[PDB]
Design an enzyme around this catalytic site. Structure first.
Site, PDB file in Angstrom:
ATOM      1  N   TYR A  27      28.757  38.662  29.210  1.00  0.00           N
ATOM      2  CA  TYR A  27      29.217  37.652  30.153  1.00  0.00           C
ATOM      3  C   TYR A  27      28.487  37.583  31.470  1.00  0.00           C
ATOM      4  O   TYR A  27      28.684  36.614  32.213  1.00  0.00           O
ATOM      5  CB  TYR A  27      30.712  37.799  30.398  1.00  0.00           C
ATOM      6  CG  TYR A  27      31.479  37.412  29.168  1.00  0.00           C
ATOM      7  CD1 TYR A  27      31.777  36.094  28.920  1.00  0.00           C
ATOM      8  CD2 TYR A  27      31.828  38.347  28.213  1.00  0.00           C
ATOM      9  CE1 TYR A  27      32.417  35.712  27.787  1.00  0.00           C
ATOM     10  CE2 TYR A  27      32.483  37.984  27.067  1.00  0.00           C
ATOM     11  CZ  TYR A  27      32.789  36.644  26.848  1.00  0.00           C
ATOM     12  OH  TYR A  27      33.446  36.247  25.707  1.00  0.00           O
ATOM     13  N   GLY A  29      25.683  36.716  33.868  1.00  0.00           N
ATOM     14  CA  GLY A  29      24.442  35.978  34.017  1.00  0.00           C
ATOM     15  C   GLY A  29      24.317  34.930  32.960  1.00  0.00           C
ATOM     16  O   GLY A  29      23.628  33.944  33.182  1.00  0.00           O
ATOM     17  N   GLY A  31      27.430  33.678  30.039  1.00  0.00           N
ATOM     18  CA  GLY A  31      28.575  33.699  29.114  1.00  0.00           C
ATOM     19  C   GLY A  31      28.040  33.506  27.704  1.00  0.00           C
ATOM     20  O   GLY A  31      26.850  33.771  27.469  1.00  0.00           O
ATOM     21  N   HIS A  47      34.926  36.313  36.194  1.00  0.00           N
ATOM     22  CA  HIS A  47      34.202  35.453  37.117  1.00  0.00           C
ATOM     23  C   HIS A  47      33.861  34.135  36.454  1.00  0.00           C
ATOM     24  O   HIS A  47      33.982  33.082  37.058  1.00  0.00           O
ATOM     25  CB  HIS A  47      32.952  36.191  37.574  1.00  0.00           C
ATOM     26  CG  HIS A  47      32.159  35.458  38.605  1.00  0.00           C
ATOM     27  ND1 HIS A  47      30.905  34.981  38.346  1.00  0.00           N
ATOM     28  CD2 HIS A  47      32.426  35.179  39.893  1.00  0.00           C
ATOM     29  CE1 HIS A  47      30.449  34.387  39.436  1.00  0.00           C
ATOM     30  NE2 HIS A  47      31.327  34.528  40.409  1.00  0.00           N
ATOM     31  N   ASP A  48      33.467  34.183  35.196  1.00  0.00           N
ATOM     32  CA  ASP A  48      33.191  32.967  34.435  1.00  0.00           C
ATOM     33  C   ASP A  48      34.463  32.145  34.300  1.00  0.00           C
ATOM     34  O   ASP A  48      34.439  30.935  34.492  1.00  0.00           O
ATOM     35  CB  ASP A  48      32.664  33.294  33.059  1.00  0.00           C
ATOM     36  CG  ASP A  48      31.278  33.926  33.062  1.00  0.00           C
ATOM     37  OD1 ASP A  48      30.588  33.964  34.072  1.00  0.00           O
ATOM     38  OD2 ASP A  48      30.923  34.483  31.965  1.00  0.00           O
ATOM     39  N   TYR A  51      35.144  30.458  37.721  1.00  0.00           N
ATOM     40  CA  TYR A  51      34.369  29.244  37.855  1.00  0.00           C
ATOM     41  C   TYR A  51      34.864  28.152  36.941  1.00  0.00           C
ATOM     42  O   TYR A  51      34.845  26.980  37.298  1.00  0.00           O
ATOM     43  CB  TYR A  51      32.912  29.510  37.556  1.00  0.00           C
ATOM     44  CG  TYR A  51      32.087  30.176  38.639  1.00  0.00           C
ATOM     45  CD1 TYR A  51      32.596  30.582  39.860  1.00  0.00           C
ATOM     46  CD2 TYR A  51      30.754  30.393  38.396  1.00  0.00           C
ATOM     47  CE1 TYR A  51      31.773  31.165  40.807  1.00  0.00           C
ATOM     48  CE2 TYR A  51      29.932  30.937  39.360  1.00  0.00           C
ATOM     49  CZ  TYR A  51      30.458  31.334  40.560  1.00  0.00           C
ATOM     50  OH  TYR A  51      29.593  31.877  41.489  1.00  0.00           O
ATOM     51  N   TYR A  64      28.844  28.574  50.563  1.00  0.00           N
ATOM     52  CA  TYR A  64      30.012  28.922  51.351  1.00  0.00           C
ATOM     53  C   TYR A  64      29.590  29.927  52.426  1.00  0.00           C
ATOM     54  O   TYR A  64      28.549  30.538  52.355  1.00  0.00           O
ATOM     55  CB  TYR A  64      31.134  29.490  50.451  1.00  0.00           C
ATOM     56  CG  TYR A  64      30.702  30.636  49.598  1.00  0.00           C
ATOM     57  CD1 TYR A  64      30.553  31.905  50.131  1.00  0.00           C
ATOM     58  CD2 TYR A  64      30.390  30.469  48.241  1.00  0.00           C
ATOM     59  CE1 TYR A  64      30.126  32.957  49.351  1.00  0.00           C
ATOM     60  CE2 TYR A  64      29.959  31.507  47.478  1.00  0.00           C
ATOM     61  CZ  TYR A  64      29.810  32.767  48.027  1.00  0.00           C
ATOM     62  OH  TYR A  64      29.357  33.829  47.281  1.00  0.00           O
ATOM     63  N   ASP A  89      33.633  34.652  43.826  1.00  0.00           N
ATOM     64  CA  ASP A  89      32.488  35.536  44.039  1.00  0.00           C
ATOM     65  C   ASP A  89      32.905  36.847  44.681  1.00  0.00           C
ATOM     66  O   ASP A  89      32.479  37.912  44.263  1.00  0.00           O
ATOM     67  CB  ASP A  89      31.418  34.828  44.877  1.00  0.00           C
ATOM     68  CG  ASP A  89      30.649  33.780  44.103  1.00  0.00           C
ATOM     69  OD1 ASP A  89      30.953  33.518  42.932  1.00  0.00           O
ATOM     70  OD2 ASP A  89      29.708  33.217  44.707  1.00  0.00           O
TER      71      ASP A  89
END
Ligand SMILES: CS(=O)(=O)Nc1ccc([N+](=O)[O-])cc1Oc1ccccc1
Length: 121
Positions: A27, A29, A31, A47-48, A51, A64, A89
């Site tokens: 996962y 870098g 998925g 994290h995926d 997002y 951000y 993040d």
């Protein structure tokens, strides 16, 4: 943005995002299939998903702002997308730090065919 995330990762962990977290497990870098290989890979899975919660945001490119308050990451107010991206993040960077103990170089450049099956967010 991806570059900001990479700086956050380096700040947190002392590892460069490329190559340490750009091709790790199933996962990180990239998925999007398989059982995550370890806790670090589960940081990337989540994290995926994080997002994925933001289909109308653009986490690769949208920038951000954040600051540190004694080591703690504080996302500063931007657009709604920016705030939400930052929170994703931040969590991943913290997660990587929390799992550095079990990070394994054998999962760098992990081959795709060893990552099979849907795992729902
Ligand atoms: C590497 S990239 O071209 O900058 N795209 C991209 C960036 C990060 C991740 N990821 O899984 O963390 C995955 C990424 O790419 C994919 C997203 C979804 C499915 C497959 C690849």
């Amino acid at each position: 943005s991806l570059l900001e995330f990479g700086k956050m990762i380096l700040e947190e962990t002392g590892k460069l995002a490329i190559p340490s977290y750009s091709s790790y497990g199933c996962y990180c870098g990239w998925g999007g299939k398989g059982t995550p290989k370890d806790a670090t890979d589960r940081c990337c899975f989540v994290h995926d998903c994080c997002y994925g919660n933001l289909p109308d945001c653009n986490p690769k490119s949208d920038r951000y702002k954040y600051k540190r308050v004694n080591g703690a990451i504080v996302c500063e107010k931007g657009t709604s997308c920016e705030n939400r991206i930052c929170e994703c993040d931040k969590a991943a960077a913290i997660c990587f730090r929390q799992n550095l103990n079990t990070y394994s170089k054998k999962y760098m450049l992990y081959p795709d065919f060893l990552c099979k099956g849907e795992l729902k967010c």
